[PDB]
Design a protein around this ligand. Structure first.
Ligand SMILES: CN1CCN([C@H]2CC[C@H](n3cc(-c4ccc(Oc5ccccc5)cc4)c4c(N)ncnc43)CC2)CC1
Ligand SMILES: CN1CCN([C@H]2CC[C@H](n3cc(-c4ccc(Oc5ccccc5)cc4)c4c(N)ncnc43)CC2)CC1
Lengths: 270, 271
């Protein structure tokens, strides 16, 4: 139980133990808080995030408490910002699906992963929040194989400046619904499109979306009604959900409440 | 057979509009036949979009801007509303071509070829102390043999701002326009250079929107803080370096089109 009164904490309360990896806009560490609590710490790169803007958003994030969302524990306000969360022992779902243990998960387990993520996104949907960067790399997996959504809303507070431009694409074209690419219209419905791509990621154990296709080829193909074909070992029930998520009109995409209910039914059937 | 060089102001009756090519904000464009034998394009301006006297004054400058990489301005019709008669370009706009089945398959050397052709045309405009004012892939035309020609050069200056054109939305697009042109109406050959950089990104991405995922306010504030579009997939560093030169904050620090044309010509043969 993280101490409820510990929100803005000093940097010295954290002992960074092990570097888990380096991303575009920050690094993540396994750490010990106050000599006793194992946590994860995301240290943002200098210039990636404003303290005032992040804190204003992080005070919304921290209220998004749900079993399928990574728990946001604390922050460090000194530059550059630290984000302190629960530690997830099996890392990202993308890495897990491409590991020895995760590549062997049977189809019912894959459906269960998808249903867990859908339940978390249904919570975000009910709370009138938006993830903005849903993909398997932003799903974390616990020691007992519970999937939790990470980085919810974080893309909104990563600044676009000379420092972050050096790091490349902020959002990946292949996961992003057409209207957010073309019009910056990020909504829960653009999250629904991304969830469809994530579902394909899960069923393919982490294959790149649209294999063999460049980003321009993906955009133009989607405009002509192309959608990723159903791959091997993908049940039609699962593929049909993906196709619903990839409707061209955002308003015609299903709710996450609908998605979770259908995924839950297909889990028990499998 | 080439256009006759004393047929400038022509009667509307000399034109047979054959097929509408598309409807724009301030006018429409038609494939037409002139005098029963000459295939042309006709841009018919919407009523209220242009003054006949102001247009004629500018059109008499535009018609002297004759160059292989600029669309040839043949004739005009002065009765309201104005018609602009030019050569016909069989593959339409470069933006549409890059998003078509055939144009989406153009190899990288061809994309560099297109860039160098446009740069050659802009170097001519630069040498003639003219200003395009609305350079983007939508305003480049492509011929049957894949020659790229610059269209609408100078036309934005004679589109009126009134109750009629205000209903058509934004006159110039924010994400294509140099900051000093947005902020102070400072349209120069150097703001064209900025726009050419955005056009070069359009070409290498086969027509993607500039600044994907970003609103217009987000683009303006990001640029003020040194953000520039990152190098995309399958964009050589040579080409991206030219874009970055075009996007210098200070206009006088942007290269000339004579420089851009020479560097793109070098990179073309290398590819
Ligand atoms: C080749 N791989 C190497 C490992 N790389 C990544 C390294 C960091 C890993 N990682 C990332 C996280 C992690 C930590 C904090 C965080 O911040 C927010 C959370 C919610 C809302 C807003 C912000 C988001 C994510 C993580 C973790 N908590 N517990 C355990 N591991 C974690 C996820 C994998 C991925 C590529
Ligand atoms: C979805 N698409 C549908 C097609 N839309 C456009 C429709 C009009 C097309 N189009 C436009 C032109 C065209 C014609 C006249 C003209 O006027 C000036 C030229 C130079 C200087 C000043 C004025 C400018 C451009 C065109 C063409 N010449 N020959 C062949 N096609 C042409 C270019 C594409 C673009 C959007």
């Amino acid at each position: 139980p993280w101490e409820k009164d510990a929100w803005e904490i000093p940097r010295e309360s954290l002992k960074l133990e092990k570097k888990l990896g380096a991303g575009q806009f920050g690094e993540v560490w396994m750490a010990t808080y106050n000599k006793h609590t194992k946590v994860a710490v995301k240290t943002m790169k200098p210039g990636s995030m404003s303290v005032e803007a992040f804190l204003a958003e992080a005070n919304v994030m921290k209220t998004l408490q749900h079993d399928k969302l990574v728990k946001l524990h604390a922050v460090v306000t000194k530059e550059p910002i630290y984000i302190i969360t629960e530690f997830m022992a099996k890392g990202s779902l993308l890495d897990f699906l491409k590991s020895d243990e995760g590549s062997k998960q049977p189809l019912p387990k894959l459906i269960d992963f998808s249903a867990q993520i859908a339940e978390g996104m249904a919570f975000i949907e009910q709370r009138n929040y938006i993830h903005r960067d849903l993909r398997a790399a932003n799903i974390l997996v616990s020691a007992s194989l519970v999937c939790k959504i990470a980085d919810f809303g974080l893309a909104r507070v990563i600044e676009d400046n000379e420092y972050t431009a050096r790091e490349g694409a902020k959002f990946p074209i292949k996961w992003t619904a057409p209207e957010a690419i073309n019009f910056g219209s990020f909504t829960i419905k653009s999250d629904v499109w991304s969830f469809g791509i994530l579902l394909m990621e899960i069923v393919t154990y982490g294959r790149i979306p649209y294999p063999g296709m460049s980003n321009p080829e993906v955009i133009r193909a989607l405009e002509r009604g192309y959608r990723m074909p159903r791959p091997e070992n993908c049940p039609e029930e699962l593929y049909n959900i993906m196709m619903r998520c990839w409707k061209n009109r955002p308003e015609e995409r299903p709710t996450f409440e609908y998605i979770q209910s259908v995924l839950d039914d297909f889990y028990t059937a499998t």
